[PDB]
Structure 1
Amino acid sequence: FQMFWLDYCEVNNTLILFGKVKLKDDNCVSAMVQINGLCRELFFLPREGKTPTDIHEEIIPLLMDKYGLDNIRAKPQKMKYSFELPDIPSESDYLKVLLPYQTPKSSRDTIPSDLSSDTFYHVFGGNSNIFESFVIQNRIMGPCWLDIKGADFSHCAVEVSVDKPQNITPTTTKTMPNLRCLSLSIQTLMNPKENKQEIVSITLSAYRNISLDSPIPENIKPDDLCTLVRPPQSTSFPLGLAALAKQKLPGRVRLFNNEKAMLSCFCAMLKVEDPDVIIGHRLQNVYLDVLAHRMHDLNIPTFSSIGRRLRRTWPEKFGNMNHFFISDICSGRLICDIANEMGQSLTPKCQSWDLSEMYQVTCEKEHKPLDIDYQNPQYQNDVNSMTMALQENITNCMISAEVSYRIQLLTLTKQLTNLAGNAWAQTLGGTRAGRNEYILLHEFSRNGFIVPDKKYQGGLVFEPEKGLHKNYVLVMDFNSLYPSIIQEFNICFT
């Protein structure tokens, strides 16, 4: 069973991977694989004078009694530690014990690292997360093809369960499927009564076939364009909106009465279409936040369509922790926020990172932004104002999608993910410490090293000879000073 994984989620001490699978007719559809039996990689560090056999004979009976396990896989293993903890020998033989994430009893208590005993005085790898454990032990390096054997038959077309993380092994295939991309554009208003922002119009620009192997053509037309419109002030739209929308507004325009029906129809379209990638401009910081809050307040039973996991209940703590909550709900669909830290990192020439400015910078095409304030009754009496605002929403969605493909946000993030070994969404979010952490994790784990469990003077600047220098002057720089320094003097943790 071959699957190209995209994102992950954790629940009930199990890890679930979201990806695409070729059918018999090699058609690519969404898939979900729930993987059981994932287990923690423990290391017991013996005290001076004791051996892993003593740690075995002492602790494994206690561990089997404690976790209610029939048997526990464990073996002495020589391992190297070269990190910041003191009293840890440079090389010692450890008792490499294997503890499943899901145990019959007391499944969510982690063995303390500082745990002392007569045989050992330290434990390593006791609080590692499920995704870390799988991505390290099975040597997964970013999104890549995945061979699954003994598959046992969410908002994914295929649902798969496997009880052994081993059968799941990465392939050598560098070719990767076509992506279902759905760009988003959102228009909001604050209501003075409750002082909350409310969704007015949502634009859905679908790009069903995007292949990151070959280059993306410029200004590709979306395979489908649909819009969802809500009465901003009154409950009745100005007469003639539908006919004018069909005569002028591009794509389909479907019209509503209230916010609840609009969000329900949005959820239905999201579930039916099943994007792989969600484009947008300031989506994660603003638009996804307001979308989720409006979804929760209006009590839509299908809020889980924004991701690929099927949730009947909203997490109870929802109501500055909303970032993680949104990231967890939207698990399955990548958020390609063109204005986030990664997006800003790929366009340092912009000053405000507004949609118009970034369009002008990346695509060299000028668009004049229009200020839409639906609080003005111009959009409840006039129909031309409503259709102009809808046209602006369509234009914003198209611009966001096009500039997203212009900078290869997805392609760069995928390449750096396969370089780092983290997940695609995490590096899409703009992190830099996560990629470094995971590349070091993979490199040190593959070389028999014990990975650690989860203010100084800088460079020297000279005083300039301030003034004008009419003679020819040269610039003499060091190509990547710090990396070539670390290679030069062989600076390392080890």
Structure 2
Amino acid sequence: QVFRFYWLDAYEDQYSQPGVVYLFGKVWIESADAYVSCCVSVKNIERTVYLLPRENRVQLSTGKDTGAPVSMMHVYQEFNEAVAEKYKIMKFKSKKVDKDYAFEIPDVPASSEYLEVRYSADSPQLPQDLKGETFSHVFGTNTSSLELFLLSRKIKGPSWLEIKSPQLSSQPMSWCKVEAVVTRPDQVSVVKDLAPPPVVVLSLSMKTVQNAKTHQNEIVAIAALVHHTFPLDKAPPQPPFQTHFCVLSKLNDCIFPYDYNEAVKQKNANIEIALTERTLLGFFLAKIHKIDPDVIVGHDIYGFDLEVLLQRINSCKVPFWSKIGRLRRSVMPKLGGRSGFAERNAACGRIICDIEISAKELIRCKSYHLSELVHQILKAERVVIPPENIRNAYNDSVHLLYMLENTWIDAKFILQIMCELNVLPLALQITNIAGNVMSRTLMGGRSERNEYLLLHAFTENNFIVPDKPVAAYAGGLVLEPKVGFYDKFILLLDFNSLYPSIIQEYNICFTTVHREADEIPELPHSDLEMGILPREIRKLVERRRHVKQLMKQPDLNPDLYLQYDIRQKALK
């Protein structure tokens, strides 16, 4: 009955299904003695809000202070009588909680007795600035469902979760092989000290052509390399790909050179030749559904690959577009938006790895084009197929097979680059340290990681976190140099983790320094206890130090050494 599964990604739709979080991952099946994809739907993640009592009753901010002391009973009565009826809230459960607070909202004391209201997510949402007669502020009005789930259940990054008393599904809700429904969030718990399971990986490369009339890109070839046991905590497997599949479609005008049959017959049986782009897209979707990859990797996947894939699927009305993702949906996500959030939603439940973003984050190169990346990482030369020659290649079997093999080689290069940098294990480590979702980590950026790190740190220590938002100061000192040439030994003395060590030493934190809503605040007293930000910083620093010790091991492999270096950099 107890469902033990490893979770990799989480998807929520704030507008369609309120209070539902779709976790995806892997579960172990003895009948097949293997790992299969699973989708668990956590339901009824009730909204939680915190009301801050006033010190003296105020006549709806009209008569100002009245002098009547306020207790939690007064706040509960005010919420039950006025607010609930006004905002159409039917049923709710309220309690009292003593919580601390130190952030950028004035008049909020350090430690106060808040009233915690828990009510379903189907009801309307209270306004942020809602002020009554006994409470002066409301916190948590717009908190998301996924954030509430992760913070309440103390879930940090991919891990093993146990579910007590799972329930089946009345109708299918996902393209996975195993499904379960949790009627409460308290039924999910995290089990520590277990190894990560293998995860399938699919590296895909597309070759297209721009039809001038429509100025729209048309797909003519796709190649994919698939590994069914890619590890998340060990070195990449050699070779980096187990199986492969290639699909090639004739253009809307040109025809094969009356020898493609013999060419494919004599080459191999893994190449699928289709006549219309609709068939190509359908076969690709079916193959993706059958393989069921947890990680899909590519170059410019967010920018060009997935966007063109979805555009062509919409244009060709290819049935079952939702196969591209892991959740069965009827309306396609709107095409557009910043970065690739629309593309991410289209592939909900499947981690997407763009080697461009990871290369930008991890290493430094003059250009992040695929050719330059292959030159700098794999140390190999990649041939380039001119855009104007792909169309003309539909005149001989040899040229068409060469084009398909070029796509295959591009896919292999992408997979090799992914393996070299340890993109996946490093992403897992960073996600576990921070506590965000893996797809967010692999989409790039730094703000989300620290945001979730501090969110977890504060929630664990009984704090009320801020509400999500809806050369400004002096920096370092650069001494004036004595420019010239020096032919004698120059000794460079550098501080170790300067700013983190400053935060630790002087105890700089939200709960220590006394801010006032552009002057430098005074240093905190030395009689206090270490805050949250210092402690977290210390943890990170120690991690880095340990990695450095590993780097110091004598007689270590070069490549591994380099990997360690990268890790160090990341942590720093």
TM normalised by structure 2 equals 0.81
User: What is the rounded CA distance, in whole Å, between the counterparts of 1:259 and 1:491 in structure 2?
Assistant: 60
The residue that corresponds to 2:342 in the other structure is 325
The residue that corresponds to 1:137 in the other structure is 152
Measured after TM superposition, the shift of residue 234 of structure 1 is 2.9
Q: Which runs of 5+ in 2 are unaligned?
A: 57-69, 169-173, 512-572
The one of 246, 253, 256 equivalent to 1:227 is 246
User: What is the rounded CA distance, in whole Å, between the counterparts of 1:374 and 1:258 in structure 2?
Assistant: 21
Residues 259-408 of structure 1: matches in 2 within 5 Å? 259-315=277-333, 317-318=334-335, 320=337, 323-340=340-357, 342-348=358-364, 350-364=365-379, 366-373=380-387, 378-408=392-422
User: What is the rounded CA distance, in whole Å, between the counterparts of 2:27 and 2:431 in structure 1?
Assistant: 20
* Secondary structure class of the residue paired with 2:344: helix
Q: Are the structure 2 counterparts of residues 319 and 170 from structure 1 closer, same or farther at C-alpha, using a change threshold of 3 Å? A: closer
Does residue 506 of structure 2 align to residue 489 of structure 1? yes
Measured after TM superposition, the shift of residue 378 of structure 1 is 3.0
The residue that corresponds to 2:262 in the other structure is 243
User: What is the rounded CA distance, in whole Å, between the counterparts of 1:23 and 1:129 in structure 2?
Assistant: 33
Measured after TM superposition, the shift of residue 61 of structure 1 is 4.5
Given that 2:336 and 2:342 are in contact with CA atoms closer than 8 Å, whether structure 1 keeps it comes out as no
Does residue 108 of structure 2 align to residue 88 of structure 1? yes
Measured after TM superposition, the shift of residue 173 of structure 1 is 3.4
Given that 2:53 and 2:114 are in contact with CA atoms closer than 8 Å, whether structure 1 keeps it comes out as yes
Given that 1:182 and 1:204 are in contact with CA atoms closer than 8 Å, whether structure 2 keeps it comes out as yes
User: What is the rounded CA distance, in whole Å, between the counterparts of 2:390 and 2:162 in structure 1?
Assistant: 57
Measured after TM superposition, the shift of residue 301 of structure 1 is 2.1
Does residue 134 of structure 2 align to residue 114 of structure 1? no
Measured after TM superposition, the shift of residue 67 of structure 1 is 7.2
The residue that corresponds to 2:449 in the other structure is 435
Measured after TM superposition, the shift of residue 375 of structure 1 is 5.5
Given that 1:289 and 1:322 are in contact with CA atoms closer than 8 Å, whether structure 2 keeps it comes out as no
User: What is the rounded CA distance, in whole Å, between the counterparts of 1:133 and 1:78 in structure 2?
Assistant: 19
Which structure's CA Rg is the greater one? 2
The residue type paired with residue 416 of structure 1 is I
Given that 1:155 and 1:271 are in contact with CA atoms closer than 8 Å, whether structure 2 keeps it comes out as yes
Does residue 32 of structure 2 align to residue 32 of structure 1? no
User: What is the rounded CA distance, in whole Å, between the counterparts of 1:56 and 1:314 in structure 2?
Assistant: 43
Measured after TM superposition, the shift of residue 71 of structure 1 is 4.2
Given that 1:233 and 1:375 are in contact with CA atoms closer than 8 Å, whether structure 2 keeps it comes out as no
Measured after TM superposition, the shift of residue 313 of structure 1 is 2.3
Does residue 204 of structure 2 align to residue 184 of structure 1? yes
The residue type paired with residue 288 of structure 2 is L
User: What is the rounded CA distance, in whole Å, between the counterparts of 1:469 and 1:8 in structure 2?
Assistant: 58
The one of 270, 276, 279 equivalent to 1:252 is 270
CA shift digits 1:308-359 (9 cap, x unpaired): 01112223x437358322111111111011111x3321122x2212223222
Does residue 138 of structure 2 align to residue 123 of structure 1? yes
The residue type paired with residue 363 of structure 2 is T
User: What is the rounded CA distance, in whole Å, between the counterparts of 2:350 and 2:152 in structure 1?
Assistant: 25
Measured after TM superposition, the shift of residue 41 of structure 1 is 2.3
User: What is the rounded CA distance, in whole Å, between the counterparts of 1:437 and 1:230 in structure 2?
Assistant: 46
User: What is the rounded CA distance, in whole Å, between the counterparts of 2:127 and 2:111 in structure 1?
Assistant: 21
Given that 1:189 and 1:375 are in contact with CA atoms closer than 8 Å, whether structure 2 keeps it comes out as no
User: What is the rounded CA distance, in whole Å, between the counterparts of 1:486 and 1:407 in structure 2?
Assistant: 31
Given that 1:301 and 1:312 are in contact with CA atoms closer than 8 Å, whether structure 2 keeps it comes out as no
Measured after TM superposition, the shift of residue 248 of structure 1 is 4.4
Residues 43-62 of structure 1: matches in 2 within 5 Å? 43-49=50-56, 50-62=70-82
Measured after TM superposition, the shift of residue 65 of structure 1 is 4.4
Does residue 20 of structure 2 align to residue 4 of structure 1? no
User: What is the rounded CA distance, in whole Å, between the counterparts of 2:345 and 2:81 in structure 1?
Assistant: 38
* Secondary structure class of the residue paired with 2:481: coil
CA shift digits 1:222-259 (9 cap, x unpaired): 2221111122463421222243345447x711111121
Q: Which moved more, 1:458-467 or 1:125-134?
A: 458-467
Given that 2:374 and 2:382 are in contact with CA atoms closer than 8 Å, whether structure 1 keeps it comes out as no
Given that 1:7 and 1:18 are in contact with CA atoms closer than 8 Å, whether structure 2 keeps it comes out as yes
The residue type paired with residue 343 of structure 1 is A
Q: Which runs of 5+ in 1 are unaligned?
A: none
The residue type paired with residue 30 of structure 1 is S
Measured after TM superposition, the shift of residue 462 of structure 1 is 2.6
The one of 16, 21, 26 equivalent to 2:22 is 16
TM normalised by structure 1 equals 0.93
The residue type paired with residue 208 of structure 2 is T
Q: Are the structure 2 counterparts of residues 322 and 493 from structure 1 closer, same or farther at C-alpha, using a change threshold of 3 Å? A: closer
